[PDB]
Design a protein around this ligand. Structure first.
Ligand SMILES: Nc1ncnc2c1ncn2[C@@H]1O[C@H](COP(=O)(O)OS(=O)(=O)O)[C@@H](OP(=O)(O)O)[C@H]1O
Ligand SMILES: Nc1ncnc2c1ncn2[C@@H]1O[C@H](COP(=O)(O)OS(=O)(=O)O)[C@@H](OP(=O)(O)O)[C@H]1O
Lengths: 288, 287
């Protein structure tokens, strides 16, 4: 049902958003950033947790014992996220000592103005639309606060129209792509992390002005592999109660591959999606 | 669990997987006595049997739609090997028929009763592309009693590629009938051809059956056998069968070519196409 679908959402500045977050939006827009804040921005399900753990490790010189001191969602606050009596992203950040690492799924136009004014470093991670759609679909089924996503074809329709939390994936990646032309905003691809993790890890170390030793690279590559992070309670979100995230249905660290869309899209839906994709993306220099 | 289900529902006869009810009295099919003027309509399951059957029936009745409704199609055109104790019996239906008889079967050439070959009966074979057949066969499994749970479509398609479904390998079925189709008395047709140019195929069928073609006869056959008309015709849509046997909550599902695109994922299509080429590369048969 359409009525029930949007009942869980509310638009903020034109993009559909989780109702709970919108409640305290003023706090997000008035957020006070610091010069050395590091923002990790992504469209939902593009690999946020993966790049977040890599960055954390670079900050802690690859000390695994330091990356387990707390769960990922506490070490790296989810900026716009807030749920009464559960979590408060803005607060965690306000009470955190610099250098702070900020997680967000906001398009660049909605990122709190303070981050832009202080010209903070930003890392953006992009993933192919079809794999994002598959992963986002399971997120709907797993995380509380989501309406029934309908059948997969139905959900993909919502996805193509940008009628999902955080809006149009197309506008999201195209806007960040433009921001990414600046050396201050590192634009990365999930597919690149998959193809040659070492190359991307080294790039991230240099972007973050750190020393790229073999020891550091080795530990990051090992600690951030899918198998390790999937069994690491600090990064696999398994500490969250099932009412919030029921991973018995589908685990957060689901498959961690590129191309899972081939297992979900019918040839017909693939054809429909590809046609729509081209009309949405042919003018952008962004390419996979 | 699925394999056990399949084991409970099907059994082989002459090496071909078959519905258990049809195997218990196979001797009755093996010894079936054909008549010289019998006309056999052979097809792999869900290839359009009902469509060509009604076209042929109309040709026999000089296009008299009323004579084609005197009874349901499964009574007008007995299903040869169909048997379920004393509740259903195709051979019995045929034996009591006062000819000319039109016979429906899904048997591969090797299992067709020797009598049909010995009497050199005319045979019409209808073929349909494998992917669309798999889709339609999947639905058949779900709506008709006597089948195991087919599981997901990808799971069912694996069993299909291995010929582990009633009537066996679709690949061997169409290839064997293709060879038989080289004979002047075996007309080999394609479902896709009936979709592309029904008039051409109907005229071809009229000549094969040695009848005189006329614009009025052809025209009547064309609209009477159209998907939309046959779907609403109780004589041809199998709706008179109780839900216990066939649960249409429909047999006349879509009636198009290409529904496979709405069921195969890119990955399944890739795997299927690869396996298909290995199975069909050595045949001149082309869909
Ligand atoms: N280390 C590593 N290696 C490979 N793949 C990984 C890794 N960490 C996370 N993932 C995959 O990222 C998907 C989850 O995305 P997000 O972290 O962005 O989720 S969220 O938006 O922050 O909730 C999810 O994708 P899917 O498996 O396709 O669903 C995860 O499996
Ligand atoms: N007139 C007409 N026009 C177009 N398509 C038609 C027609 N009559 C039957 N059909 C389609 O044939 C499919 C059923 O196949 P069969 O008749 O062989 O079934 S059975 O094996 O005899 O039970 C089934 O295919 P699907 O729709 O793809 O499932 C029917 O819709």
């Amino acid at each position: 049902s359409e009525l029930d679908y949007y009942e869980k959402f509310e638009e903020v500045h034109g993009i559909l958003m989780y109702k709970d977050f919108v409640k305290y939006w003023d706090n997000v827009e008035a957020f006070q950033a610091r010069p050395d804040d590091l923002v990790i921005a992504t469209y939902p399900k593009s690999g946020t947790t993966w790049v977040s753990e890599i960055v954390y490790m670079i900050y802690k010189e690859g000390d695994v014992e330091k990356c387990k001191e707390d769960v990922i969602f506490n070490r790296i606050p989810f900026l716009e996220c807030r749920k009464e009596n559960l979590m408060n992203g803005v607060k965690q950040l306000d009470e955190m000592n610099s250098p702070r690492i900020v997680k967000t799924h906001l398009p660049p136009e909605l990122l709190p103005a303070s981050f832009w004014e202080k010209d903070c470093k930003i890392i953006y991670l992009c993933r192919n639309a079809k794999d994002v759609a598959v992963s986002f679909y399971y997120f709907f089924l797993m995380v509380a606060g989501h309406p029934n996503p309908g059948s997969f074809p139905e959900f993909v329709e919502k996805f193509m129209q940008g009628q999902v939390p955080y809006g149009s994936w197309y506008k999201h990646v195209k806007s960040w792509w433009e921001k990414g032309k600046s050396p201050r905003v590192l634009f990365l691809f999930y597919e690149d992390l998959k193809e040659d993790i070492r190359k991307e890890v080294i790039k991230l170390i240099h972007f973050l002005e750190r020393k790229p030793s073999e020891e550091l690279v080795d530990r990051i590559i090992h600690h951030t592999s899918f198998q390790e992070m999937k069994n690491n309670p600090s990064t696999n979100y398994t500490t969250l109660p099932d009412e919030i995230m029921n991973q018995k249905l589908s685990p957060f660290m689901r498959k961690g591959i590129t191309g899972d869309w081939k297992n979900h899209f019918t040839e017909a839906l693939n054809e429909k999606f590809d046609k729509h994709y081209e009309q949405q993306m042919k003018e952008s220099t962004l390419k996979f």
